Design a protein around this nucleic acid. Structure first.
Ligand code: MG
Ligand code: MG
Ligand code: MG
Ligand code: MG
Ligand code: MG
Ligand code: MG
Ligand code: MG
Ligand code: MG
Ligand code: MG
Ligand code: MG
Ligand code: MG
Ligand code: MG
Ligand code: MG
Ligand code: MG
Ligand code: MG
Ligand code: MG
Ligand code: MG
Ligand code: MG
Ligand code: MG
Ligand code: MG
Ligand code: MG
Ligand code: MG
Ligand code: MG
Ligand code: MG
Ligand code: MG
Ligand code: MG
Ligand code: MG
Ligand code: MG
Ligand code: MG
Ligand code: ZN
Lengths: 80, 155, 127, 60, 206, 24, 98
RNA sequence: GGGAGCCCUAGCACAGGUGCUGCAUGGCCGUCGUCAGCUCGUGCCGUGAGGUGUUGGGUUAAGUCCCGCAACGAGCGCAACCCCCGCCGUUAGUUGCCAGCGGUUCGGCCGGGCACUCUAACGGGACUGCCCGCGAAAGCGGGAGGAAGGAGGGGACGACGUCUGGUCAGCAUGGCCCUUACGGCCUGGGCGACACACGUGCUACAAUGCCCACUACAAAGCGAUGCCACCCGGCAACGGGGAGCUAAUCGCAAAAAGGUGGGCCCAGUUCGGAUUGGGGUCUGCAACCCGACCCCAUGAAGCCGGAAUCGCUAGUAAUCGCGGAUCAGCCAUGCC
């Protein structure tokens, strides 16, 4: 129960960057600050570093997690 | 009431028995301002008082109120010691209120499902001498004449 | 030709028209009982005519605007009681002590700030 | 508030959803009755000085 | 806590609005803002004249500013070359063509805004506060008036602990609407803090 | 009552309309 | 059949200038439909009395717009000529349709 | 070649600081308290601080009035002047009507008139004025007439002061403090963190009840890059189309309890809607953190609450819905 209508959203500066690295090889690590962006099928492969307000994180990117938003994988707060 | 003795309000008589007591009862039966279905109860109860008894309902309602009115009650008292349960008389104004309140409360304890029925049976049972209302009255007066020893604080 | 009184009650206004007739009362293009269907208080709108012997000696075309039906009952009641006095000023004797002429100035009290509800005061702790 | 933080002056706010109010008199960002453009505190002051035409102590 | 603005309370009756125009809920906001700018350019530049109040009225686009000063001398200037400069300096902030008028104040000692304004200036010139106030009141009481009252706030005299000084005679009947009590507040930017000067001046009845 | 989204009472309480409180 | 919805924030100034719009005649030239009452619209603002806390303080302000109607039937041209420079209120406004 | 203007570096005068200090302040607020009180001038008393007045006897909601008296008056307070409600009149007829006749596509829709309702300006109306009884008086009890009767109901309105009360983060403002950061801009995060505890609330635990259908009566408000009739698609949120309304005329708008009909039948239930899985809508550049809404499934705790404890004296409490402000949206069950 979320919200992507007849629009679907992926922040594009990160997208033109990943599709670019789909002309050849996969760049180990991509420095993003946009956790805002949904994951497309074309991201399954290259490990993206989602920020945190504090640290980019090694979010490896399985196909089992496509429809999800990036920030769903870089926990913000620290607990016990 | 610190200043004036504070008078009682005059409920307008019933629409169907032209009586004041019956408004009073209907008012105690009513909750949340729903006076329409409080009367819609008391009257439904009245049909039932006949189709279960040859007697006219007003005469029975009145008859049962009298059987629940308490001639004596205690109200506590702080002294030069502690709480003493002083047996008091009970004004005719307070017997009214106590009877009616007790009647509704007793009625709503009952296991009958419709409200009119509960009122009906309590109203009946109380006329015929028995029923929870009367029990918390024969009870009340039993605490008086048991604390009789403290009658000498008559206020 | 007819007889008239106003009668208001708590944000509600009746206008009472008194014809000579059979006792047929009509309220807002509808029958009297069709309009107050199943409201036990209803019969008390006609307590003037009952207590000046007129229950069936008048028809009554009554228009009613505003509020809620139970206040409309009280307001019609004032309406009738007034028409029936400008039809025969002597009727006051068997009408004024009953109270039917007075208008019930009891109206909803304003909502006060820092209260919940005019008088309902917000609940507090530690005291 | 911070004199700097009247980048409410920024006529283009980039996205129309970064647009906010601020009292045109004191800067207050938090009770700015939009009719007057004034915050709650300024409104009562101006109301009392009789510089809000037509505005009056209201009681009922 | 206590005590509403004796003006804003009487605003209904005995005292009318400084700016008195009408405007819709898409205009009121704007006219009000610009109306303020005028008072600001006015209260700063006209200090010397000692401006009690500024009435502002609007209509078919045009704006009728009616300034009330004790000494209309200082707003006229070279026989004009000042009331022109200011009706001009208003034409820039107000693109809507202004009309500056000047109103004499017969009795500066019967307008609370000026009386208070008077006291304020002394406190900066380090006058003796207690006297200033007893005096100020007398100057107002000597000029007719049914009554009057003045108040200076806190830090009277550089005194480390803020106080309050008083003075008032005649009737100053605050809770009666049927009054007419011109009120005036003056600020006093001293070396060691700020001080507030409130002035009440009762006159007339109905 | 007023808490259940899929009822008359409940939809009235929460401003809304829908399957359970048709707009008309 | 001219239409004139009058409105301002003061009503002493309205009824005393709607009256001055009915200066065609009392009832001898064009009909005159009398100064029409027409309900006022009351905006309210409710302000917390002090700065910083004290929730329970509060003070009410209102700004009320009063509205009149008048309306004149059969507009002779001299009746209109009077709609020129003949006014005094500043806080009164003037809608005109026909 | 020299120069007015605005653009320009590299320096200086200065900006800026929601950094500190209600333990320097203004302003505004809270509070005792809408409590009936705080004083002053002049006289008199007392070496004096002070007192008298303002104590006493009645009486009031009231230092409210009366009577008394070395006091006679006065000011800030009380009350009255302002507002909203209750009855009535005059002015006023693009809202209102079997009032009265004509027409009806049985809608005040049409002619038509404003009587009535209303709308909103200005007035009348109450005075312990009239009667009976107690009273030295003020006043008290009662009774007429009246829509209302002794303060008719509710607002606004808060004395000299108290708290060294709250607030320098609304705004001022003395001082102290930082000045390639204690200033400034971004992007992301936070203010929403959870083993726990409290406050104020909401929704409940059901039969005077819950569900569905039909049907009836409000007041106050808000509406232009807004309210959206009506039509079409969708279970629906909502999308497409589109009428009217600068709104007493169009719309939000359904008032809801109520009334009539039917169902449930004492059950953790057709009570309660928490949680969770899924599929969607709309707002916004963007809803992971952290939006609201709709739909399907899930259907928790809760059977009226220990010690303790809060509100309310009348259209009050209780209960039922409606509106606004703020605001793209919305965590509103809050507030007005
Ligand atoms: Mg790029
Ligand atoms: Mg209510
Ligand atoms: Mg600042
Ligand atoms: Mg915003
Ligand atoms: Mg349910
Ligand atoms: Mg208060
Ligand atoms: Mg040059
Ligand atoms: Mg500086
Ligand atoms: Mg302070
Ligand atoms: Mg009082
Ligand atoms: Mg001695
Ligand atoms: Mg002496
Ligand atoms: Mg004494
Ligand atoms: Mg005494
Ligand atoms: Mg007095
Ligand atoms: Mg008063
Ligand atoms: Mg009238
Ligand atoms: Mg006909
Ligand atoms: Mg007497
Ligand atoms: Mg503090
Ligand atoms: Mg927070
Ligand atoms: Mg706590
Ligand atoms: Mg459909
Ligand atoms: Mg049923
Ligand atoms: Mg309980
Ligand atoms: Mg009370
Ligand atoms: Mg409740
Ligand atoms: Mg909103
Ligand atoms: Mg609400
Ligand atoms: Zn402000």
């Amino acid at each position: 129960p979320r919200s992507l209508k007849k629009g679907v959203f992926v922040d594009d500066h990160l997208l033109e960057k990943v599709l670019e690295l789909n002309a050849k090889g996969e760049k180990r690590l991509i420095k993003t600050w946009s956790r805002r962006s949904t994951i497309v099928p074309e991201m399954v492969g290259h490990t993206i570093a989602v920020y945190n307000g504090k640290q980019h994180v090694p979010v490896y990117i399985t196909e089992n997690m496509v429809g999800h938003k990036l920030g769903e994988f870089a926990p913000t707060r620290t607990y016990r | 009431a610190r200043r004036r003795r504070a008078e009682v309000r005059q409920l307008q008589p019933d629409l169907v028995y032209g009586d004041v007591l019956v408004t009073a009862f209907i008012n105690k039966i009513m909750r949340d301002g729903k006076k329409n279905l409080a009367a819609r109860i008391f009257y439904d109860a009245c049909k039932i008082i006949q189709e279960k008894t040859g007697q006219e309902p007003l005469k029975v309602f009145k008859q049962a109120v009298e059987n629940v009115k308490p001639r004596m009650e205690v109200r506590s008292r702080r002294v030069g010691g502690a709480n003493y349960q002083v047996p008091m008389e009970v004004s005719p104004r307070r017997q009214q209120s106590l009877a009616l309140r007790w009647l509704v409360q007793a009625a709503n304890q009952r296991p009958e499902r419709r409200a009119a029925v509960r009122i009906a049976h309590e109203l009946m049972d109380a006329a015929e001498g028995k029923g929870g209302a009367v029990k918390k009255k024969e009870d009340v007066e039993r605490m008086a004449e048991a604390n009789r020893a403290y009658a000498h604080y008559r206020w | 030709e007819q007889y008239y009184g106003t009668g208001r009650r708590k944000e509600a206004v009746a206008r009472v028209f008194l014809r000579p007739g059979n006792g047929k009362v009509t309220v807002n293009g509808q029958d009297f009982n069709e309009y107050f269907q199943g409201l036990v208080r209803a019969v008390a709108a006609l307590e003037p005519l009952r207590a000046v012997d007129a229950l069936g000696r008048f028809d009554a075309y009554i228009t009613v605007r505003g509020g809620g039906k139970s206040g409309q009952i009280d307001a019609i009641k004032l309406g009738i009681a007034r028409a029936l006095v400008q039809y025969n000023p002597d009727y006051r004797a068997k009408l004024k002590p009953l109270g039917f002429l007075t208008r019930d100035a009891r109206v909803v009290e304003r909502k006060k700030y820092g209260k919940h509800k005019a008088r309902r005061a917000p609940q507090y702790s530690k005291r | 508030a911070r004199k700097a933080l009247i980048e409410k002056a920024k006529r283009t706010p980039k996205f129309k959803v970064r647009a906010y109010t601020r009292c045109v008199r004191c800067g207050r960002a938090r009770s700015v009755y939009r009719f007057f453009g004034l915050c709650r505190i300024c409104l009562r002051e101006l109301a009392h000085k009789g510089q809000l035409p037509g505005v009056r102590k209201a009681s009922w | 806590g206590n005590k509403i603005h004796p003006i804003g309370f009487r605003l209904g009756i005995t005292r009318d609005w400084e700016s008195r125009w009408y405007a819709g809920k898409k205009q009121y906001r704007h006219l009000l803002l610009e109306d303020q700018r005028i008072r600001g350019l006015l209260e700063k530049e006209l200090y010397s004249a000692g401006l009690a109040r500024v009435d502002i009225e609007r209509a078919a686009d045009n704006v009728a500013v009616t300034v009330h000063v004790a000494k209309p001398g200082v707003v006229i200037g070279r026989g004009g070359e000042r009331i022109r400069v200011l009706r001009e300096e208003l034409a820039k902030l107000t693109g809507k063509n202004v009309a500056l008028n000047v109103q004499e104040v017969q009795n500066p000692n019967l307008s609370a805004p000026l009386v208070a304004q008077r006291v304020a200036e002394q406190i900066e010139r380090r006058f003796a506060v207690r006297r200033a106030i007893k005096q100020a009141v007398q100057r107002v009481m000597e000029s007719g008036a049914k009554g009057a009252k003045v108040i200076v706030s806190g830090r009277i005299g550089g005194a480390e602990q803020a106080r309050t000084e008083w003075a008032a005679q005649g009737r100053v009947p605050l809770h009666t609407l049927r009054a007419n009590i011109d009120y005036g507040f003056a600020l006093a930017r001293t070396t060691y803090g700020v001080l507030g000067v409130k002035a009440y001046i009762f006159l007339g009845e109905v | 009552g007023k808490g259940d989204r899929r009822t008359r009472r409940g939809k009235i309480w929460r401003g809304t309309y829908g399957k359970y409180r048709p707009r008309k | 059949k001219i239409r004139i919805k009058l409105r301002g924030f003061d009503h002493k100034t309205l009824d005393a200038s709607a009256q001055k719009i009915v200066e065609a005649a009392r009832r001898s030239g064009a009909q005159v439909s009398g100064p029409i009452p027409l309900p006022t619209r009351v905006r309210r603002f409710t302000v917390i009395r002090g700065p910083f806390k004290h929730k329970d303080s509060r003070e009410h302000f209102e700004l009320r717009t009063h509205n009149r109607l008048v309306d004149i039937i059969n507009p002779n041209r001299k009746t209109i000529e009077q709609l020129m420079t003949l006014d005094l209120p500043t806080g009164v406004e003037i809608e005109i349709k026909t």
